[PDB]
Structures are given as structure tokens and as C-alpha cells.
């Protein structure tokens, strides 16, 4: 196909034609995509941010490409350090909140790794661990474990959507809500497609299986790992793995994940926390509990809005065009029998032992006045435990993706900052971040993610995608809350396209040196600048600071 | 001081004089000491390898260094890359088995970071955590604690001896026995010297803390870190801290360390297996257990010599000097009141859980027969128990030295291999490393230790220092052991410094992807190659394979 | 032509059919390939490897080329150089078991130089010698000689099959049967097209012929040579003639060949060998013998299957898949009246000379139990000693191509390590053949070929080329069996395709200083890389190793 929207920096359509020609001939007309919707998430779009934030002709791709398998992958990467065409490599695309499926810069080739690259490799039982392909969501496995009675032996650890992929999910440092939660931790054993074309397998992947008659002649893609490869993380010598995470350093195809033995028992929980203040001492409370093992999972401290955007829009609570005020957030908390803070949490293994830990828990809660226990079946059918039930052992749901509907034409952005899991600490970032919120004409909507030590605060500011006054004010509240953020001492874990260069540049420390460090490695690894360019404002030498930076 | 015996590749004595001279400048005549004695552990030498194996000229310093601070080290590393000099720092030099604190190339300056860089700079209760510099042994760390009265509160993880850096210790990626055993793991906040002289700090280290009248005009070494440094490791973008352990990419001056709270109850035990084989159905019963939680830290499997072995020398059990029979071997055992393999573990927490999983552990290991169970109290006052019972609560020992002597002028060599958590691949890899053993003359000597889905596999090679013939038998044996496991899809952790080139060459699946991607980014970050050439394998471009490579 | 299946690394179609165009106008469209059948050995494939045991895709030209004459030549290497287009020059293509015409590099031009080069440029009777066009293959010249009635003065010395190209079998360092066999070392003046594409001759065919008004106005290539030219092979300074042989150093046009005088008289000979033991006392006769010249050939060492499979295939032995026993080799022996082991030789010269050789093998053989002689006459009509009765007179016979049809689908891959002349150096390098041929499914066949101080142990790996599962186990054993041989200390002379990385990786001495030294003269010759990369193992700069090599 001939002519695309937008085409790359310094490409002509003559090399485009070429190029898009010689990738058709590898690939198939079927598998390569001219952009010459918004979609949904069952069906995500591949060309363009569908929560758009930022204006027109910013991450819009030139075309989708569909690699068949890993050698389309190396050929494709030839042919763009041949003609100096960057590439956007996805696995499946849903990073709604962070961008979608779009390019960090405008006229790159958006790689759908995952639309053939789909398989699960391999399941082990005894190792308790898989080997994904991009392609394979968390329903996808989850399915797959079903098909092959594997459910009572090994249980996933899933995000909130069970339509993610687990392998991109991993490689961005995503989170879930098992004692698995901490997903790029999870992980052993990574191959790699270079930006030089090479093929590299990560730690004990380095080790060659041994050969054997069986495996004699396959290409390297298909070749069977050794015995440690996804058991033992490190292999020897410098642990490399970490850059392939966050980072424009390579393209992941394939990814080794420990999973989770049934653990012989398990109960969902929830406890609702009466008061805004409340937050503070809970908080408190949860700290010691979170080191101890008391809480073993990823627990979640859920504001009221979260789990009421949930069950309905905002037109069916009050019809307001302002933020809801205190006052109506305690009634909507009475309406559905949940506090202003909503804890979840779950207890696994023998029934003695949660039994002990559960006492602990209730006793060091009752401390909080007005505090009431829930489990799953104490609560209506259409509850958030109930769906959270199901995610807290390893089952993928799509319940959450309603919060996102609660302004007529939502379109949502993630702000996440990290704080200590200290009551004064907490209190402190969301008063930062509900005061600006205010000041933007939006209704705070949020969760804190309990880490061991830091609680990844996900603050969900949703907005009408087709009102031009709302979407500056929401750039604004972005940018402003980042500064404020940064100023008493907290960063960012993960955020969108548009403000990737901003939240770099507050991890500034002694003149930018981590930064600085970042370019040196991507220039000597990726000399003509080809893969995914400006992914967590780290740029290639070709790409002029001045001209892209946001 | 004017005439080393060894100089650095390629450089002048008048060079290596002026370059001294500017040192002595800098540190002082009492920091800088010029070689023109195997000491102890008490007193580690700095200057080559004690338990020597490989032949004279080889890992031997022209002169050792002690920088007094951080700006000391940059100065260094600015005159190192003036004078094409190279360094190999280390903290405090007690890698025994592993080289000690000997170069990898003759010449070189060693870089003794811990003789004045000392200090514990934080030891934080609410985010449990410590934050240390090169020089703080296990040992001082302890001290700290009890002086402070924080043991009521926090507890280390130690490696067998209580002499090692914390710091060097966790980016070896070495090993302890609490559940907080995986040290690398437990880091959260580094501060590197770059090979360009640069200070950089990773992670939420790299945010910087917020401006402050009392903090205003400090060097960046003496700056605070932000809140978030050292409890959430990630950072931003590229995860980049693994380039910093088992490589020569800068020179590690800080680390933050996560601690363990008081867990409220600990029982340590030893379970003892009556035959050779019962490793097997040992490991087996030790997979499902590991993986659930009964087994919470790193359990060890040793061998009835280790235990022998502290307890006294080889010319107290036997007069021969070719290997124990198996014959003989049992009749230690019985000596001992041990098995021919003894499990070593522990339960942490609250009686109640400690009893559950104390009955899960018995009823699993009664399968085996003629097992039985000690708790310390049950066992002699000189029993391994006792002294285990300290370090797998984290406290400091140095009995487990004591088996270094078991010969004459016992060296001692670690040759250490991961295996798979399964009896059918520790008996294979036990069977093929006692057979070439026995074929070189000595005892089979190891532990395993549990890891949760793999086990480090410490055989300890130990011989006559002084014997020519045994020293020329244990390279021998080294180097076909290194060959056999990887014929059987076994690689090693970590090694001493003549065998790392063969160690990182087993590492060559797809031709060697692995290593060519660690060069690329070590001649990218170290383009005069100073820091440290040919840790791992590892060689930056001006330093020939063919001439160093052994 | 315009689609070809496989294009070279980093070439647009654009610029194939470019190149394509250019090189049919400089020969004609007849002269020219495009690939967008294994053929035989009558009509060579020239376009892949026909006796495949790689899958598809690997070793397949993108076009086959043949040049009308030396300028051609130079003008295809001058557009090669242009476009950066790898090229693989061949002679006749017949190295079948070696891989055939087959590029080492898949997309490659296949330089077919003997169908237009092939002339019998000079026989010279005083001097014994010949010149000779990449074209002529042994049958040619045989039929030179006899048309011109000059067998009666010069004989040839052929390898078994008689259409083989002269020139290429012996820049291979191919071996003959007379005492003219080491090819290689009966050579004397080449011609080459170098990388750069100029033309050079080498030792005394650097002294030009002086100027002489019938040879003025000649272009280069048709210039004739001095008089010592094909006389004396050293010229002066660096003798550089074998850097020309197994390499990729350039392409070789012409060259002079040793012939022997008719030596007035001969006879050739065989002796059996009873037992599968006795060629440990036969070899350790053949010693002394063949360093005094009562052996003064290269007489050979069949195994009986060699013999049999001459004769018919396995099916006409016995109808068992699996390697026929120990028991079933002595029947077959016996039907044949043949040993396990059959010893073929000759005798040169004046009758009374060869009859007191003759009384010294005879002797020498008799201390080996149930030996046998005989000569052409006392054998059948269709034995092997009738037909190595013409080879070790340098008459072409092609009888030998019959055993590769020993399978169904017989394709064959020759494993080809060198052993001492001595029993238990043989017997140890066959025992460890045999015992992986067994484990493979496959019957050990093989040769010994004796050298004058090493033997070339030729093992016939036979296979069913449609037979995936023993393509694999073929697979397996080669590269087994290399590494099994290097262990022992012993190393290949020549071998496939697919093996040469593999057999060039055994060869490395002090940390492989011979292939880095080749690399150098490689990429100093041959800056754009465009003659036959990865010939030997040996790789241009432009081909990345983690890429290319097997
Ligand atoms: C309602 C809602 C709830 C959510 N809940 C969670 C949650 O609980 N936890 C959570 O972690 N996230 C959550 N998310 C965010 C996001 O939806 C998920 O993280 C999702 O899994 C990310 O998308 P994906 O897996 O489809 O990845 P992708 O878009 O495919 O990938 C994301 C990024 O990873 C990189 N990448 C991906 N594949 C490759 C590859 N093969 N090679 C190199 N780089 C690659 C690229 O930079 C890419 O843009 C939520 C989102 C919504 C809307
Ligand atoms: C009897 C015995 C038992 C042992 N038990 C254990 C055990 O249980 N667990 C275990 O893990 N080990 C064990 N070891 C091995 C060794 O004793 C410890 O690992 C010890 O802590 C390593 O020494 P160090 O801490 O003195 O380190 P150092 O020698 O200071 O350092 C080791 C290496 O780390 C790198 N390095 C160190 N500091 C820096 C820096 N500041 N910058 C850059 N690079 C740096 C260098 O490559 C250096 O050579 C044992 C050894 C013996 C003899
Ligand atoms: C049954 C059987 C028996 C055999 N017996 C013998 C034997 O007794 N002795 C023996 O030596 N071999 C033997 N061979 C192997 C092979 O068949 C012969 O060696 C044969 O002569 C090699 O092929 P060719 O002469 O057609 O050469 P080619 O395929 O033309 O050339 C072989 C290689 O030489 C190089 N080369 C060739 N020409 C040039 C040139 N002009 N410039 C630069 N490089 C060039 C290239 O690398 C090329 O691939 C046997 C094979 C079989 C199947
Ligand atoms: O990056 C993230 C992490 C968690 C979530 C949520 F909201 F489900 F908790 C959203 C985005
Ligand atoms: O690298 C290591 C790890 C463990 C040990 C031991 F033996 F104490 F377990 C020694 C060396
Ligand atoms: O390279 C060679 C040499 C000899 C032979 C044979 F078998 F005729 F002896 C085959 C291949």
C-alpha cells in the first residue's frame, strides 16, 4: 500500500513503497497494514491513542506489521536499519491509560507481535512455571490451564483486565494481586530479538540444551531451553535482564513466568473503612502486617468512587457536571454498604494457619472505629469482592473496565506515583493529588497497590475524549501533579506517551546521570536509532532532544 | 614507592611512578602500598591469591589503594583513565574460593573501598531497611544493631562467615539462610562510580530528595536519597541495577539492603538421612515443601564430610591419604550422631503456624527411613545445629572455616553448579561430580542449598597448597567438571578467577549472543577499559582474547 | 530474470534485478540462472545441497552464474563488490558429501566456472606436467591424453570417481591413489581473480614469459606462463599458494598439475584381512613399509560393507532396518571372499624392482592369520580389485558411486578425521566411530587411506534423504562424533557445509589464534566480504557470527 498519513522522520514515500513492498513479500498482504476508530478493548486499535489526550498527528502510525514468527521479526529489523524506520513493538496492544497501542513517535511501524506470535510453550509442573509467547493473554492461559486440568495444580496471577498480555504486562512491571503480584519478579529465562537483528536468551537461556537427535537442526527461535533456564534467573555474569524492561533496549518474544502451586486453601476479604480519614491509620495498621506476612497477596486500598464507577455511571449517582462533594461520597458509600476507603484483601493455604492470620488481621482492624468484615457471600451478586475474589486467585475478569465509562465518553489516564506505606505519607499524596484533581472540575478516583514497602497509588482520571476544554485541563492536572509529586519526594512507576520525557527528567539526580548512563547504553546497542525511540525519554542520538521531547 | 614486580599491560615504570606519586598526592603515603604473604581470614591479603591453584604471575597487583571517600575514587578513576591503568576494586577482600582479592590481570591496582569506607549510614525501622558502604562486614552490622538495641526489632541474613561485605556479598549474588537468603534480591538503592568517573544512583535513587536548608551545598555522595530510594527498587524506565553485580560496569560505593522485622518465633532443626541415597528422595519430598512455604528460607543439604570436616581435620578420622571409602564414610556418620546427608532448616513466626507446618515437615520426611529430628538442645554443645541456629537467624559465625583445614595447607576451590529441585537431577549431578572427585585423588565435600525452584550445589575441591602435583590434579578436575555439567545442561553461579573465561564460553547459545551483547555494552560505558578487565569472562576491546583468555 | 527465493544479506530485489541485468548482458541470457531438483551425478544440481541434511532455506543460491571466460569473471567480482553480492565459485560442483554445489551463504551467486572454462590448456611431456581450466574433469583429461596417444608417456592420479573437476579437487586437497596422490602437493603455478578482482600468478608464474612478437597485445588471463612456471612451486619470497587452498581467498582460473612417466611396469594387488581385530596388526605392519616405499602409493583399507555396497544395496544383503551384527559383516565376507578388512595396493616400476617389494609386503602381511593374496585376474569380473586396478594406474572409473545407494534414498555426508599409522591409534578411532554410527541406526562404513605418516579415515555416513527422523540422528552423529574425535586429539581434513564452523571451533589452540590470523588476511583481501563467506569457518567482518554460524 502507497500512501500513509504520516510517514517516519526523513523517509521518503519512494523508500516507504519500498520498504512496506519488501515486508508484504516476507510477511503477506494479510499480515502488513497501510494507515493511509477508537476501536474497543475486545477489539483494540493499533494505529492511534483511543483515549486521546494530546492532539492530532502525535503517536500515529504509518503502519501495523504482523510478524509471522521470529524469523519476520529478524527481517524486519534488517530492513529498518536499512532504511532507518523506527519500530513500535506490542504484544497485544491493551496499555489503555498508558497509550494504547500508539508510537512514541508519529510514523513508526507499529510491530503486532501477538496477532501470530500467540503460543503457550510450555506449562511445568514440578519447575511451577510457563513460557509465553506475546500473543498469549491472561485468559489465554487461564484457558489453557482449564483445557488441560492444570487448575488444580497451578493458579495465574492476573491485573485487573484479563485481556493483557502476560508477557507485556511483565516486561512494563505490571501489577497483580497474588503473592505473585510483583510481575516482572516473576519472571526467568527471556529471548530477545536485538536491534542488530541478533537472537539472545537471558541467564541459565544462555546455557544450550544439550543436543540431542530430537533437535538436531532447528533454528535458534525454535530451539528447546536448558533444564535452569526458567528456574534460576541469573545465569552468570552481569544480570542484563532488567533493560529489557520499561526500555527501548530489544524486542521480547518469548518469556519464562513462575507460577503459583495451589496453595491448599484460600478466603477473599473485604473491610470497609467508614471515614476519608480513615485512610491515615489503616495504612498504619497495614505496614507492619505487610512485612510480617500477615498479608501475603497484593492487597488494595480502594476509594469509594472506584468501586461505585464500577457498578454505574456517573449520571445514575447525581447529576453534577462538578466533582461530587464529601457529602454525597458518604451516601454513595451508605447506597452500597462500603466505607470511603475499601480494603481487599485474601488468606491462602491450610485452613489453621489462615485462621491465625485472620485474627491478626481482624483484631489490628477493629482498632479503626466503624470498621465491618466482609466475605464474598456476605455481599450482593453484582459486588466488587466478588469480582476481586475471583482476581485475587489467579482468575481474569473484565468487571473494571466499567470505572472507565463514567463520564459519557470516557477515555481514561493513569497518574501513578509510589509512597510509603505510612499513613502520614499516603494522607499527604492524596491530598496533593485530590486538591488538583478539584482544581481540574474532575472527581478523584483512585487506589493504593500494597507493595512489601511502597504502595503503587494509581490515581484513574477519566474524561470526555471528545471535550477539547477538559482534555487541556487534563493535560494540565498531569503535568502540574508530576511537579508537585516530585517536589515532596515521590516518582513515577509507569505512565502514557505524552509525559514519558517529564517523568524522566524528574529522576534527575546529580545532573541527569541516570539518563545520561540510559543513552549510552541504547546508542551502542542500536546505533541507527530503529526501536521504539523515546520509549521512557530515553532517545537515540538521531532524534534530536529538541525537536521530539514533550 | 618505585618497583612493582608486576606492572599493568602496556605501561612504563616512569608511567607507574608518576601515576603512585599522584595517588600518594591524593590519599596519603599510609592509603597506597606498592608491591615489590597468604595472611588469614582475620587478615586478608590484598595483593594475590592465597589458596593459589594457578602458577606464579598470575592475579598479582602492582599496588593496593585505599581510597579515604567517594571524591578518592573518582580521582582515581580520572588518573586511571589518563594512564590507561587498571583497577579491581573489591570491599573487604574475602572471597575465598573465589581468587580473594587478587586481580584478574597481573598489574593492576586493587581498590580496597572498605578500609575507609566503613560506615553504616542508616539503619531505618518503619521501611526495614539498612543502607551500607564497602567496608561494613556482617560482623559490624551486627554490632551495630546490638549497640543500638534494633536485634529486638530487625535481624540480618548472613552467608556462613560473618567476616564478608554485605555490600560485596550482594552483588556477587551470593547466598544466606533466613528467608531474606537471596542477598541480591534484597537490594533496593545503589551508588556507582561509572568507568568515566561519574556518580550514579539507580532506581528511586535517582530521584532526587527534595531541597532542604540543612542539606544545601553537599557533594552528591554525602546527599540524602528521596523517600522511596531504598523501599521500591524499580525506579523509572530500563531497570538497570543487575549491570552492576558479577561485572565490571563501575565501582559499587553504597547499597541499600532490605531487613528482616523480628518475625515473633524461630525454631531452627536438623533432620538426618541415614544413606547416600537418600538425597533423592530427600529432594523430592523437599520440592512441593519449598514451594508452598513450609520451607520459608534457604534449607541446606550437607554432606557428613562438611559436617566432619569443621569438627575436625582428615588426619583425626582417618590416616590415608587417598579418599574415605563409602565404608568409612558411614562410620563417621555413626561418630557423629549424623546421616550421610543432613537437611538444616528453621521456622519463623507465631508458635501456632511454626507447629502446623513443623508437623507438615515430619509426616513428609518419615517416608525415609530411620530419619530422625533434633532441635539444638538435643545435640552436643560443638554440633553444626548450634552454630546453624545462630545463622539462620542472622547472627555472625566463623566455625564453618574450620573445614578449609581438612587437609595439611588445605586451599580451598568452589566449583558451583545450580541444579534442579528434583532427586533424579541432584543424584545425576552429585554421581558425575563425585566420580571425577575420586578420579583426582579427594574427597567428595558439599552442601546444597534450597532455593525455591532451583539449589546452588557447593562442591568444595580442597587441597595441599603447597603440593604441585594435587594443585596441577585440581585444575584438572575444575575444568572437566565445568565440561561435564554442561554436557548434562548444568552451568555454574559464580567462580573463581581462572575459570571465568571457561565458565562465560558455556554460556554460548545462539554463537555466543550473551557474551557479545555484555561487550557492546562494557566498551560503550569503559572505552579504556579500566574497570576491572575480564571479570566474568568479560574483556573490553584492548585486551587481546587470545593473550588473556585462560 | 526477477524473483528469486532467497536473496543475499541486505539486497533489495530492485538492486537483484539490477545486478541480474548487468551480469546477463556482460554473458547472455544462457549464461545466467535466476531460482525463483537433486539432479545427479551425471548433471550435478548447482543451485543447493542435494544429499540434504539441513532443512530448507539453508545453503540455496539466489542464481547460478557461469562466466565465458577470465574476464567475465573479473567483471562479475567488480559488480559484486559493487552491490556487496556474496559469490561461490565452483569447478564441476560434484563434492557430494561435502555439500555439493551448495552456497555456504543462502541468496549467494553460484559461480559455475567449468562450463565455459574448460580447456586442457597444456600437457608438457619433458617437464610432466599439465595446465588446466576449472572445466576439465578427470575423464576430460584421460581423454586428452588418449586422443593425443600420451599414456603411453604420462599417467593421471584420480580420485574414485572420474568426474570430479581436476583443479577443484585438488584446491580441496583431495586424494588419489598413485604416488601422485596428495593432490595438493603435485601443483605448481595458479592463476586467481582476487577479491578485488585482479588477476594474479603464483611462485614462478609472477616471472613473465619475455615479450615475444607472437605473444604481444595478449590480455593477461591468455598470456602463457614462464619457463619454470609448472616446474618449481616456491618462485621467491612468501610462498601464499596455500592460502589459496579451502579457503575463501579467491577464485582460482588455472593451474599446473604434476604428471607421472609411465613407470614401466606395474600391478596391482589385494590382501584379505580375516578378522574385524586385524587391522591393529595390519596398520602396524603398514607403518615401516610405508615410510621405506615398498609401499609407494596410497593404498587403502577397506571395510567389508565398502566392498558390498560397491556390489548391491543392503536390501540384497538383508532385509533388518537396523546396523547388520558382527555375525552378519563374516557372511557377507565369506560371499564375497573378502576379510572384514581388504588392503588394496600397487607396485610401479621394472619387474625386477616390484618383485623384491612384492616378497617384503607378502612377508610382512603373512604374520597376520588367514591373509589371502591376490591380483586383478584371480578375483570375478565384477570385483572392486578390477576396478581399483584402473584407479591406481590413473585410469576414471565411476563403479564406486554405488554404495551411496547402500539406503532407499541414499544421500551421503563423509565424517573425515585423520588417525597416526598405527593399530592402536586406528583401532581406537574406529571403535569410537563404530560405537556412534550403532547408536544413530546406522552401519559403520568407512576407509583408510594411507598418507605417508597419517591415515585419512573416510566414514561414509549413509542416509534416506527423505527420512526426516534419521536426517536428525545424521545430524546428531556428525557433530558427536566431531567432538568425540577432538577429545581424543584427533581433527578432520575437509568436510560439509553445515560442519565447517563446527570442525573450525576444534582447531583453536591458544584461545583460536588460527582462525582470528585467517580473519585478518580474510578481511584485509577482501574488504566488502563478497567470496564465499564462512568457507573453513572463516567469516568477513560484514557477517555477524551470532548470525551466520552453525
Ligand atoms: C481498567 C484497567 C485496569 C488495569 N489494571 C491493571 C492492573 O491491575 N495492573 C497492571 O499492571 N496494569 C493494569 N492496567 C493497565 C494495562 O491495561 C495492563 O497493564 C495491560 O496488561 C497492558 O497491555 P498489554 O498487556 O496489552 O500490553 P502491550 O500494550 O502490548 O504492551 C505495553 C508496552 O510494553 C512494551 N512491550 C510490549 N511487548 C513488547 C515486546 N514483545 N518487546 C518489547 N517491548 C514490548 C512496549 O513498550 C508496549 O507499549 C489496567 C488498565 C485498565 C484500563
Ligand atoms: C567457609 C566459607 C563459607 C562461605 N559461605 C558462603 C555463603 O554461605 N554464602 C556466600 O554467598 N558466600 C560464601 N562464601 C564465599 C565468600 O566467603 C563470601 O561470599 C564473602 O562475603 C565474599 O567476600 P567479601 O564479602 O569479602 O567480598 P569481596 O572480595 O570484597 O568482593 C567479591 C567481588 O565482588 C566485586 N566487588 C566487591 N566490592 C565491589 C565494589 N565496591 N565495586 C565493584 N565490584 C565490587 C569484585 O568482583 C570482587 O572481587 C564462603 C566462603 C568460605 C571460605
Ligand atoms: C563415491 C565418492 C567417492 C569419492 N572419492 C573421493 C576420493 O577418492 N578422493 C577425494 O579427494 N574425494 C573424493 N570424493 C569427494 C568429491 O566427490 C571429490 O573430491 C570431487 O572431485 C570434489 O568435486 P568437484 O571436483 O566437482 O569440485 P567442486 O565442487 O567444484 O569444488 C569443491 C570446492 O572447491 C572450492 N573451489 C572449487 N573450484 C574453485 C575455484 N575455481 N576457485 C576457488 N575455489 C574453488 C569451493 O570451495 C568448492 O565448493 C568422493 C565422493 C564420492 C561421492
Ligand atoms: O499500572 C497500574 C497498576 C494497577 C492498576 C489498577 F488500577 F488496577 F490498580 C492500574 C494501573
Ligand atoms: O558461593 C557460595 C555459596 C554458598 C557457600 C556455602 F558453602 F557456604 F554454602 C559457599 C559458596
Ligand atoms: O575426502 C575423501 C577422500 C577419500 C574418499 C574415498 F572414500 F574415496 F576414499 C572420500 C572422500
Given at each position: 500500500?502507497?500512501?500513509?498519513?504520516?510517514?517516519?522522520?526523513?523517509?521518503?514515500?519512494?523508500?516507504?513503497?519500498?520498504?512496506?513492498?519488501?515486508?508484504?513479500?516476507?510477511?503477506?498482504?494479510?499480515?502488513?497494514?497501510?494507515?493511509?476508530?477508537?476501536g474497543?478493548?475486545?477489539?483494540?486499535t493499533?494505529?492511534?491513542?483511543?483515549?486521546?489526550?494530546?492532539?492530532?498527528?502525535?503517536?500515529?502510525?504509518?503502519?501495523?506489521?504482523?510478524?509471522?514468527?521470529?524469523?519476520?521479526?529478524?527481517?524486519?529489523?534488517?530492513?529498518?536499519?536499512?532504511?532507518?524506520?523506527?519500530?513500535?513493538?506490542?504484544?497485544?496492544?491493551?496499555?489503555?491509560?498508558?497509550?494504547?497501542?500508539?508510537?512514541?513517535?508519529?510514523?513508526?511501524?507499529?510491530?503486532?507481535?501477538?496477532?501470530?506470535?500467540?503460543?503457550?510453550?510450555?506449562?511445568?509442573?514440578?519447575?511451577?512455571?510457563?513460557?509465553?509467547?506475546?500473543?498469549?493473554?491472561?485468559?489465554?492461559?487461564?484457558?489453557?490451564?482449564?483445557?488441560?486440568?492444570?487448575?488444580?495444580?497451578?493458579?495465574?496471577?492476573?491485573?485487573?483486565?484479563?485481556?493483557?498480555?502476560?508477557?507485556?504486562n511483565?516486561?512494563?512491571?505490571?501489577?497483580?494481586?497474588?503473592?505473585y503480584?510483583?510481575?516482572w519478579?516473576?519472571?526467568?529465562?527471556?529471548?530477545?530479538?536485538?536491534?542488530?537483528?541478533?537472537?539472545?536468551?537471558?541467564?541459565?537461556?544462555?546455557?544450550?540444551?544439550?543436543?540431542?537427535?530430537?533437535?538436531?537442526?532447528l533454528?535458534?527461535?525454535?530451539?528447546?531451553?536448558?533444564?535452569?533456564?526458567?528456574?534460576?534467573?541469573?545465569?552468570?555474569?552481569?544480570?542484563?535482564?532488567?533493560?529489557?524492561?520499561?526500555?527501548?533496549?530489544?524486542?521480547?518474544?518469548?518469556?519464562?513466568?513462575?507460577?503459583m502451586?495451589?496453595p491448599?486453601?484460600?478466603?477473599?476479604?473485604?473491610i470497609?473503612?467508614?471515614?476519608?480519614?480513615?485512610?491515615?491509620?489503616?495504612?498504619?495498621?497495614?505496614?507492619?502486617?505487610?512485612?510480617?506476612?500477615?498479608?501475603?497477596?497484593?492487597?488494595?486500598?480502594?476509594?469509594?468512587?472506584?468501586?461505585?464507577?464500577?457498578?454505574?455511571?456517573?449520571?445514575?449517582?447525581?447529576?453534577?457536571t462538578?466533582?461530587?462533594?464529601?457529602?454525597?461520597?458518604?451516601?454513595?458509600?451508605?447506597?452500597?454498604?462500603?466505607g470511603?476507603?475499601?480494603?481487599?484483601?485474601?488468606?491462602?493455604?491450610?485452613?489453621?494457619?489462615?485462621?491465625?492470620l485472620?485474627?491478626?488481621?481482624?483484631?489490628?482492624?477493629?482498632?479503626?472505629?466503624?470498621?465491618?468484615?466482609?466475605?464474598?457471600?456476605?455481599?450482593?451478586?453484582?459486588?466488587?469482592?466478588?469480582?476481586?475474589?475471583?482476581?485475587?486467585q489467579?482468575?481474569?475478569?473484565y468487571?473494571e473496565?466499567?470505572?472507565?465509562?463514567?463520564?459519557?465518553?470516557?477515555?481514561?489516564?493513569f497518574?501513578?506515583?509510589?509512597?510509603?506505606?505510612?499513613?502520614?505519607?499516603?494522607?499527604?499524596?492524596?491530598?496533593?493529588?485530590?486538591?488538583?484533581?478539584?482544581?481540574?472540575?474532575?472527581?478523584?478516583?483512585?487506589?493504593?497497590?500494597?507493595?512489601?514497602?511502597?504502595?503503587?497509588?494509581?490515581?484513574?482520571?477519566?474524561?470526555?475524549?471528545?471535550?477539547?476544554?477538559?482534555?487541556?485541563?487534563?493535560?494540565?492536572?498531569?503535568?502540574?501533579?508530576?511537579?508537585?509529586?516530585?517536589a515532596?519526594?515521590?516518582?513515577?512507576?509507569?505512565?502514557?506517551?505524552?509525559?514519558?520525557?517529564?517523568?524522566?527528567?524528574?529522576?534527575?539526580?546529580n545532573?541527569?546521570?541516570?539518563?545520561?548512563?540510559?543513552?549510552?547504553?541504547?546508542?551502542?546497542?542500536?546505533?541507527?536509532?530503529?526501536?521504539?525511540?523515546?520509549?521512557?525519554?530515553?532517545?537515540?542520538?538521531?532524534?534530536?532532544?529538541?525537536?521530539?521531547?514533550?
Amino acid at each position: 500500500e502507497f500512501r500513509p498519513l504520516t510517514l517516519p522522520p526523513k523517509l521518503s514515500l519512494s523508500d516507504f513503497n519500498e520498504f512496506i513492498q519488501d515486508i508484504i513479500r516476507i510477511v503477506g498482504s494479510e499480515n502488513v497494514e497501510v494507515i493511509s476508530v477508537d476501536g474497543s478493548y475486545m477489539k483494540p486499535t493499533h494505529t492511534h491513542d483511543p483515549t486521546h489526550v494530546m492532539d492530532q498527528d502525535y503517536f500515529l502510525a504509518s503502519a501495523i506489521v504482523a510478524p509471522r514468527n521470529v524469523a519476520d521479526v529478524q527481517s524486519i529489523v534488517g530492513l529498518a536499519n536499512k532504511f532507518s524506520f523506527p519500530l513500535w513493538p506490542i504484544s497485544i496492544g491493551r496499555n489503555s491509560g498508558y497509550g494504547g497501542a500508539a508510537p512514541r513517535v508519529s510514523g513508526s511501524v507499529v510491530l503486532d507481535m501477538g496477532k501470530n506470535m500467540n503460543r503457550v510453550l510450555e506449562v511445568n509442573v514440578e519447575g511451577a512455571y510457563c513460557v509465553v509467547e506475546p500473543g498469549v493473554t491472561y485468559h489465554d492461559l487461564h484457558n489453557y490451564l482449564e483445557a488441560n486440568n492444570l487448575r488444580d495444580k497451578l493458579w495465574l496471577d492476573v491485573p485487573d483486565l484479563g485481556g493483557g498480555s502476560v508477557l507485556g504486562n511483565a516486561v512494563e512491571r505490571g501489577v497483580g494481586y497474588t503473592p505473585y503480584g510483583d510481575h516482572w519478579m516473576m519472571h526467568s529465562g527471556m529471548e530477545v530479538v536485538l536491534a542488530n537483528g541478533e537472537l539472545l536468551r537471558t541467564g541459565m537461556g544462555a546455557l544450550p540444551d544439550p543436543k540431542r537427535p530430537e533437535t538436531m537442526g532447528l533454528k535458534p527461535e525454535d530451539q528447546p531451553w536448558s533444564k535452569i533456564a526458567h528456574l534460576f534467573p541469573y545465569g552468570f555474569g552481569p544480570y542484563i535482564d532488567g533493560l529489557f524492561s520499561q526500555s527501548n533496549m530489544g524486542i521480547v518474544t518469548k518469556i519464562g513466568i513462575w507460577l503459583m502451586p495451589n496453595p491448599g486453601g484460600y478466603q477473599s476479604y473485604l473491610i470497609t473503612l467508614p471515614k476519608d480519614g480513615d485512610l491515615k491509620q489503616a495504612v498504619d495498621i497495614i505496614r507492619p502486617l505487610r512485612l510480617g506476612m500477615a498479608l501475603q497477596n497484593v492487597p488494595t486500598i480502594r476509594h469509594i468512587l472506584l468501586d461505585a464507577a464500577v457498578l454505574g455511571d456517573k449520571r445514575s449517582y447525581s447529576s453534577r457536571t462538578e466533582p461530587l462533594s464529601d457529602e454525597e461520597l458518604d451516601k454513595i458509600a451508605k447506597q452500597l454498604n462500603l466505607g470511603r476507603w475499601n480494603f481487599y484483601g485474601a488468606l491462602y493455604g491450610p485452613e489453621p494457619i489462615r485462621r491465625v492470620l485472620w485474627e491478626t488481621i481482624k483484631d489490628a482492624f477493629s482498632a479503626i472505629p466503624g470498621v465491618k468484615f466482609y466475605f464474598p457471600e456476605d455481599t450482593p451478586e453484582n459486588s466488587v469482592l466478588r469480582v476481586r475474589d475471583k482476581t485475587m486467585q489467579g482468575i481474569p475478569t473484565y468487571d473494571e473496565l466499567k470505572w472507565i465509562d463514567w463520564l459519557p465518553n470516557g477515555a481514561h489516564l493513569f497518574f501513578s506515583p509510589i509512597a510509603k506505606v505510612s499513613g502520614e505519607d499516603a494522607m499527604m499524596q492524596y491530598a496533593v493529588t485530590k486538591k488538583r484533581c478539584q482544581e481540574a472540575g474532575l472527581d478523584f478516583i483512585g487506589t493504593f497497590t500494597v507493595g512489601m514497602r511502597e504502595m503503587h497509588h494509581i490515581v484513574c482520571i477519566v474524561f470526555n475524549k471528545k471535550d477539547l476544554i477538559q482534555k487541556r485541563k487534563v493535560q494540565w492536572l498531569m503535568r502540574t501533579l508530576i511537579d508537585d509529586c516530585a517536589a515532596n519526594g515521590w516518582g513515577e512507576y509507569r505512565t502514557h506517551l505524552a509525559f514519558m520525557d517529564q517523568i524522566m527528567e524528574t529522576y534527575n539526580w546529580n545532573n541527569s546521570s541516570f539518563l545520561r548512563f540510559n543513552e549510552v547504553l541504547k546508542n551502542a546497542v542500536d546505533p541507527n536509532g530503529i526501536i521504539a525511540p523515546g520509549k521512557s525519554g530515553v532517545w537515540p542520538s538521531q532524534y534530536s532532544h529538541v525537536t521530539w521531547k514533550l
